Design an enzyme around this catalytic site. Structure first.
Site, PDB file in Angstrom:
ATOM      1  N   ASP A  14       0.812  -1.214   0.000  1.00  0.00           N
ATOM      2  CA  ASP A  14       0.000   0.000   0.000  1.00  0.00           C
ATOM      3  C   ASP A  14       0.850   1.270   0.000  1.00  0.00           C
ATOM      4  OD1 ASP A  14      -1.719   2.061   0.354  1.00  0.00           O
ATOM      5  OD2 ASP A  14      -2.547   1.390   2.274  1.00  0.00           O
ATOM      6  N   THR A  15       1.006   1.863  -1.182  1.00  0.00           N
ATOM      7  CA  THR A  15       1.796   3.074  -1.330  1.00  0.00           C
ATOM      8  C   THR A  15       1.153   4.301  -0.685  1.00  0.00           C
ATOM      9  OG1 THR A  15       0.852   3.523  -3.510  1.00  0.00           O
ATOM     10  CG2 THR A  15       2.892   2.269  -3.449  1.00  0.00           C
ATOM     11  N   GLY A  16      -0.136   4.216  -0.339  1.00  0.00           N
ATOM     12  CA  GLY A  16      -0.800   5.289   0.382  1.00  0.00           C
ATOM     13  C   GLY A  16      -0.609   5.263   1.888  1.00  0.00           C
TER      14      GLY A  16
END
Ligand SMILES: Cc1cc(NC(=O)CCCC[C@@H]2SC[C@@H]3NC(=O)N[C@@H]32)cc(C)c1OCC(=O)N[C@@H](Cc1ccccc1)[C@H](O)C(=O)N1CSC(C)(C)[C@H]1C(=O)N[C@H]1c2ccccc2C[C@H]1O
Ligand SMILES: [Cl-]
Lengths: 99, 99
Positions: free
Chosen positions: B25-27
């Protein structure tokens, strides 16, 4: 381009004639933008994650430019804490995770 | 590997000798795992997601494997709906976004 993850992967987007900053978020199924006007019909939706759910409006067939790359798809509008480009549009610009 | 985003970017992780599924999850700034036992002392933290904030337990210097790649770093534990591998560990495994 290649974007490292030392910092939040924020990019400039153009949507509905407006420039905004948004987070490239592989954890988001969908794309959600802070309150703004968009054309066409919409329907209400609940999206959920950490902290629970928020209510958004779902607009379809919304043309968008993400870091200079154009993509069309569903865009959700509502009280998201951060503008989020999710997988539905990340695929369209050819974004992958690589390691 | 090169992970496309047509599906959720789920991988297998290993933590405390046990395999679990987690989302790349890059967020997410940090890494948060559903309730489990970790060694040592923990510190308090509050983090904000799409729905609001949750309180989690912060454990440091935790040995964790992500899709076979070894890392040692901070793991947060709390009421996340999904085991999330965030940027603190994505950087350790050399992950980038590319398009
Ligand atoms: C966002 C976040 C922060 C912290 N740490 C901190 O905040 C510590 C503060 C340190 C600040 C440092 S210092 C200097 C630098 N500058 C700065 O500003 N920060 C740094 C820790 C975590 C774990 C964080 O992520 C929480 C989170 O839930 N992030 C989510 C995105 C988000 C970011 C910010 C506000 C709200 C949301 C995540 O990427 C996602 O999509 N998640 C996590 S749970 C999930 C896998 C289900 C999925 C999700 O919600 N998905 C839903 C989604 C999202 C958008 C649209 C549709 C839907 C449906 C669903 O797919
Ligand atoms: Cl995929």
């Amino acid at each position: 381009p290649q974007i490292t993850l030392w910092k939040r992967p924020l990019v400039t987007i153009k949507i509905g004639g407006q420039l905004k900053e948004a987070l490239l978020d592989t954890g988001a199924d969908d794309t959600v933008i802070e309150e703004m006007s968009l054309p066409g019909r919409w329907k209400p939706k609940m999206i959920g994650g950490i902290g629970g759910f928020i209510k958004v409006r779902q607009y379809d067939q919304i043309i968008i430019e993400i870091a200079g790359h154009k993509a069309i798809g569903t865009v959700l509008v509502g009280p998201t804490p951060v503008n989020i480009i999710g997988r539905n549009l990340l695929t369209q610009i050819g974004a992958t995770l690589n390691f």
